[PDB]
Design a protein around this ligand. Structure first.
Ligand SMILES: *[C@@H]1O[C@H](CO)[C@@H](O[C@@H]2O[C@H](CO)[C@@H](O)[C@H](O[C@@H]3O[C@H](CO[C@H]4O[C@H](CO)[C@@H](O)[C@H](O[C@H]5O[C@H](CO)[C@@H](O)[C@H](O)[C@@H]5O[C@H]5O[C@H](CO)[C@@H](O)[C@H](O)[C@@H]5O)[C@@H]4O)[C@@H](O)[C@H](O[C@H]4O[C@H](CO)[C@@H](O)[C@H](O)[C@@H]4O[C@H]4O[C@H](CO)[C@@H](O)[C@H](O)[C@@H]4O)[C@@H]3O)[C@H]2NC(C)=O)[C@H](O)[C@H]1NC(C)=O
Ligand SMILES: *[C@@H]1O[C@H](CO)[C@@H](O[C@@H]2O[C@H](CO)[C@@H](O)[C@H](O[C@@H]3O[C@H](CO)[C@@H](O)[C@H](O[C@H]4O[C@H](CO)[C@@H](O)[C@H](O)[C@@H]4O)[C@@H]3O)[C@H]2NC(C)=O)[C@H](O)[C@H]1NC(C)=O
Ligand SMILES: [Ca+2]
Ligand SMILES: [Cl-]
Length: 126
């Protein structure tokens, strides 16, 4: 096999070789800001078809901004589904009930932690 994949959350351990013999195993690590969360794989092997076995960065977790209790009568559903930084929180209200706050709270880099965008919505009545 050639050089193992590159990921946005994982960094290969040891320096890249040009060629890897079949049955050779490479191991990765979470990049400076990440945290690994069991169980998922973070390594790979060079199979008999001289390709690497599938593997994902999707286990190395980037910090997270706190938790948001579903505003009574609307669920606090994430799109870009995750409470990690760099994404958003939206307050879709119930077919009818509209908002006293704002539809989307974006979670992102603040200092070292990551906090969402401002303060969350109230789901009132009509
Ligand atoms: C062991 O090692 C090998 C070594 O790499 C691995 O290789 C794979 O094997 C083949 C053979 O080399 C490669 O084709 C593949 O890389 C490309 O594959 C493309 C995917 O094919 C799709 O397009 C088809 C064309 O319409 C489409 O029908 C098809 O959908 C079906 O096929 C997929 C995969 O075959 C299948 O999973 C799916 O279920 C579908 O089912 C098909 O099969 C049925 C039975 O036959 C049939 O009934 C269905 O109708 C259906 O066909 C795929 O989605 C190839 O399309 C691509 O070929 C190029 O050439 C043509 C002709 O000139 C161009 O039109 C076309 O645009 C392609 O060129 C572009 O793409 C290349 C590559 O990105 C790019 O460089 C060019 O610039 C250009 O844009 C390639 O051959 C390899 N996959 C991988 C992951 O490497 C094996 O995986 C491995 N085995 C194992 C177990 O791991
Ligand atoms: C996080 O999830 C969000 C969903 O809740 C998402 O935010 C939205 O992104 C969607 C696109 O990914 C969009 O629905 C929305 O904006 C647009 O929707 C149009 C469809 O009606 C698209 O057409 C449009 O762009 C594309 O289409 C035109 C052709 O019609 C092309 O010309 C153009 O080049 C382009 O290809 C666009 O997608 C947007 N809404 C909000 C609040 O952002 C968000 O993207 C997800 N974030 C991540 C990081 O994935
Ligand atoms: Ca990812
Ligand atoms: Cl592992």
């Amino acid at each position: 096999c050639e050089e193992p994949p590159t990921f946005e959350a994982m960094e290969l351990i040891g320096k890249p070789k040009p060629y890897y013999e079949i049955g050779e195993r490479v191991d990765y690590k979470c990049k400076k800001g990440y945290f690994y969360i069991p169980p998922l794989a973070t390594h790979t092997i060079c199979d008999r078809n001289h390709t690497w076995l599938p593997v994902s960065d999707d286990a190395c977790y980037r910090e997270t901004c706190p938790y948001i209790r579903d505003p009574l009568n609307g669920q606090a559903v994430p799109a870009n589904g995750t409470y990690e930084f760099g994404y958003q929180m939206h307050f879709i209200c119930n077919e009818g009930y509209y908002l006293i706050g704002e539809e989307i709270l974006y979670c992102e880099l603040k200092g070292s932690v990551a906090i969402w965008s401002g303060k969350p919505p109230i789901c009132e009545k009509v």
